[PDB]
Each structure stands twice: as C-alpha cells, then as structure tokens.
C-alpha cells in the first residue's frame, strides 16, 4: 500500500491487438489500472438513470458482474496506489468517491454541461489530476485541472494558452514532472489541443498541436491548413475523443495517437506514432503504424491507459465499437497486425 508513480515503459516498439470484449447496454468505455488490477469502466445506458460502472478487465459487462460506483452521465476513474478514485457527473454536479466513501464535489462553473475526461486520470504520489470541462460544445468551453487528494479537491488549475475550447482530454504521463493530454475540439478545428501540465508547479498550458496530421474527426486533408501552428482550420464542427499514450524510455518520449479512418463518419481506427519532439512546435507528420480497426467496422471513442507490470508500465489504447471495446498494447516489436 504505497503511492503510484509514473515509471519507464516496458520495452517494445509496436502495438498489437491485445484483447476484445464484444457482447448491460453500455457506452463510452475506458480502462484504468492500479498496481495489480485493471477495470473496464463504462457508463450504463442526459438521463438520471445513467451510472458509472465497472467490471474487471476481461469480464463481460453484465448486471451480475458490474458494480455501480455512482450515478453519472459522464465520468472517470483513477488509482493512486492505495485506493481507487471514482469520479462522475449527474446545471450539473461533479462528485468524487474514494474507495467506498463520497468525499468532495464540484459545481458547474459555467452553469452548463459539465463533463470530465472520459478516461483514466493521472496520479502521482497521492495527487490525482483530473481534467474537467464546461460551457457547451457549441461554443467556448473551458477546462480546468482538479488536483484531487484522497477524494478531496485541493487545487483548481486554470490553464493559459489556447483555452477557448478544450474537451474530453486523454491524459498520460510524459515524465515524473508532467502530464500531457490530447484533447477534443468541437466547433473550431480538426487539430487537437495539446495540454502540458506541470505537476511541480500545478501550471497548465494549452497550445494547438502543430503536426500536419489532423487527428480529430471530421477533418480536412492532412497538411491542408496553410496557417501558423496555432491556427484553426476547416471542419471544426463535430469531433471525438482520441486515444493517446506515452512511451517513456530512458532517453526519449514516444507519443502514440489514434485517428478514425473516415474523415467524415466515425469509422475504422488507425494508429499513429512520433518519437520525441515537441508537438506544440512540430509540424512533422505522425508515422502510420497500422490499422487497429477496419473501415467497415465502427470506431468511435478511443482512450489511453497503462497496465502496470511488476517493474515497468505498458502503454495501451482502447477503442469503442458501436459497444465493444478493443484493446491494443505495446507488446514486442514489428508491424501492427
């Protein structure tokens, strides 16, 4: 019973299909992992009866298997090394549950729809960092990072940079000093905002990703936004949560991202990677690693998580398929098959 910390990633260079869960009626799945177990979280099918539930990863989500953590139309989960944090929203209120007990709450700031990262959150020591957001998807939507300690909200972090619209952030650790997040951006652009959160200084900054590979959906053709790294290109309306994990090697940080194949519908799902660099100021295209999901199959939301091995962490990306969950992980080397 000791706090988790970011650790260097398990050796490997590629991703492969790891596990598929394909049948309760659930939506918007995610996975979160503690020191020795992974849980598959989803919301049980906006509506007062919606709930945040979980089953052990590898189980089929059924009523017999599922534990109901809290009422919620949206939510997240974390593990700080001593216990699980369950977070969710049902104006709107955000509730935080630690282990068995309800602890703090947070009220919509925008007095508008409140949502959180639909993903595992990121804990260092006993401090869990959660992205929350509100103001409506149709316009300006501001995100904040809540620093949660044993279920209590101790600090609210207001970001600088491009903050007019940040939603559904997929976060992971780049290093022991920082959390980075690949965010959704409705209304304004095909480029995902990228958040850098300094955990030593509890300071966040957001800039638009510079890469010419557009990651949100719908998107214009890659390389087709003749503007400075910061500009908003076409097809801003719509959008979807992207997968994103870090590969922390002793000397380099790899960054893995998901994208749909469709520039229109949410169809298929591809995997992209870049090693090293600094996305806020780096226009180079991401390398294509392979196809996680075929174009004839649904491919909606995707998320990152990391599996804890005994002495390293394994980056993994999950994909929602309207909904079944496919898991891909950084195991070994070679092409994704």
């Amino acid at each position, epitope marked *: 019973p000791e706090w988790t910390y970011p650790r260097l990633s398990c050796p490997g260079s590629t991703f492969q299909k790891a596990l598929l869960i394909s049948p309760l009626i659930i939506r918007e799945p995610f996975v979160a992992c503690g020191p020795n177990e992974c849980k598959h979280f989803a919301l049980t099918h906006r509506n007062k009866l919606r709930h945040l539930i979980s089953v052990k990863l590898g189980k089929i989500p059924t009523v017999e298997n599922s534990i109901f953590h809290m009422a919620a139309w949206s939510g997240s989960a974390c593990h700080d090394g001593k216990e699980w944090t369950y977070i969710g929203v049902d104006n709107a209120l955000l509730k935080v549950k630690y282990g068995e007990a309800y602890t703090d709450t947070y009220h919509s700031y925008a007095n508008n729809i409140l949502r959180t990262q639909e993903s595992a959150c990121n804990c260092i020591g006993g401090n869990c960092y959660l992205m929350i957001t509100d103001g409506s998807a149709s316009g300006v939507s501001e995100c904040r990072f809540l620093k949660i300690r044993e279920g209590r909200i101790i600090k609210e972090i207001f970001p600088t940079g*491009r903050v007019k619209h940040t939603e559904e952030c997929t976060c992971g650790f780049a290093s022991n000093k920082t959390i980075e997040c690949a965010c959704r951006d409705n209304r304004y652009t095909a480029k995902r905002p990228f958040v850098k959160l300094n955990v030593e200084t509890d300071t966040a900054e957001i800039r638009l990703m510079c890469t010419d590979t557009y990651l949100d959906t719908p998107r214009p053709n890659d390389g087709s936004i003749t*503007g*400075p790294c910061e500009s908003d290109g076409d097809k801003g309306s719509g959008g979807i949560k992207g997968g994103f994990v870090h590969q922390r090697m002793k000397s380099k940080i790899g960054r893995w991202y998901s994208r749909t194949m469709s520039k229109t519908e949410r169809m298929g799902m591809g995997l992209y990677v870049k090693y090293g660099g600094d996305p*806020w100021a780096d226009s180079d295209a991401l390398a294509f690693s392979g196809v996680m999901v075929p174009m004839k199959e649904p491919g909606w939301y995707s998320f990152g998580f990391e599996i804890k091995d005994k002495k390293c962490d394994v980056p993994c990306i999950g994909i929602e398929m309207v909904a079944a969950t496919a898991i891909y992980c950084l195991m070994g080397s070679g092409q994704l098959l």
Partner: antibody
Amino acid sequence: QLQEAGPGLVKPSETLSLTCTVSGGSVSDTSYFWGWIRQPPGKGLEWIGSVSYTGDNYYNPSLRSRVAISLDAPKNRFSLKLRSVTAADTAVYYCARRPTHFDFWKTFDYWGQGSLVTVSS
Amino acid sequence: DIQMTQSPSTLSASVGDRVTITCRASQSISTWLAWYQQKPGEAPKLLIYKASNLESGVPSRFSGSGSGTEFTLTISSLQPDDFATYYCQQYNIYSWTFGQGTKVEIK
C-alpha cells in the same frame, strides 16, 4: 484606433499598469487578439503577450510570472499589468491588434503610439 | 523559443539603390515570417505577412520571400521615406521573437 495611457514612471518593485483605449473596433470581437510589445531604449522589439475575447491568452515565457493582460470589454479597452518592475523594464510599451483573418495570417496590423515608462527610485 | 538573427545590422545605401535585408531563424519557421518598418518615434508598421503577400498600402517597392530559415526583404528602389529600422519575427510557434532588426540609412 489604439491609444495607450497610464504612468510614465514607476519605481523598482512597483506594479506598472497601462491601458490601451480602443476605438473604431471592439475588444469584444472574437476575431482579434489584443496585446503588447515592448521596446527598451536603444533596443529592438520584445513581445509581451496577447489575449482574446474567447479566453485565449499568450505571454512571453521569460516574463510570464510577472505579467497579466486584461481585456476590459465593458469599457472597450485593455490593459497590461507588470509586477515587480525592476530596471531593465524601462521601455516604450506599445499596444497592438492582430486579426485572425483568413487563417491567422496577420501580425499586428494596428498599432498604438506607445507610452514610455521610466523605472526609477 | 526560436532565436532570430538579422543581417546586416547596419546598412548604408543610396537613394535609388537596392536594399536586401536577411532574417536567419535558428529553427524552421516554415513560411510564417513577418516584417515591420519602424520610423523613429513611431510604432512599427507591418510590411510583410506570410514571408510575402505584402500589407495593403505598402508602396509596392517592398516585397519579401523565403522559406524555412532564410528569408529576405527587398526594397526595389530605396527612397528617403524608406528610412527606418526594419524588424522581423517568427510568426509560427508562440513566443514570437524579434531579431535585433536593421538600421537602413539613406544617402
């Protein structure tokens, strides 16, 4: 369209507060960034920062510990606040406006006149 | 940040002469390099947008071009009204940094 006003003198450790009045346009317009450029005597230009009505805000990282910019839409104006002014901060402070037109293709099309601020005991 | 250098820092040129000013970025800035004309006592006036394009109202004597790291501004015919200090900045990644600029003296 842009005009600076405020103290022409602060002493070390004091906060400098300069306000740029906007006319012939509006700070409430989401298509523009408003901001400040510094020019120390005998030197070239240093960018300080810029803000938008949409909430976006950027600052020069070497300064972004001591600076805040406020877009005061109700009075159609904006201001620069610099804490702990020490000495090397003596400069002409200019306000400027940057449209995000076409696709963010422009850099400060409109400029103010500038206000020279001396830092002294 | 991206450090930008301008050269020559001081320029002596005649009326009717041709002026070339070069900006050297330490990192690629794609094609987003802006140029300004600062007459002493005045706020800098924008001349150039995306390396070229040319700001409306600029006398057509001015034109820029370039890509990546090395860019130039030229004045097709130098006139006394072109006496100014000229500056350029990265206009891609944030922390827009200006070089020292150049002084253009007209003789």
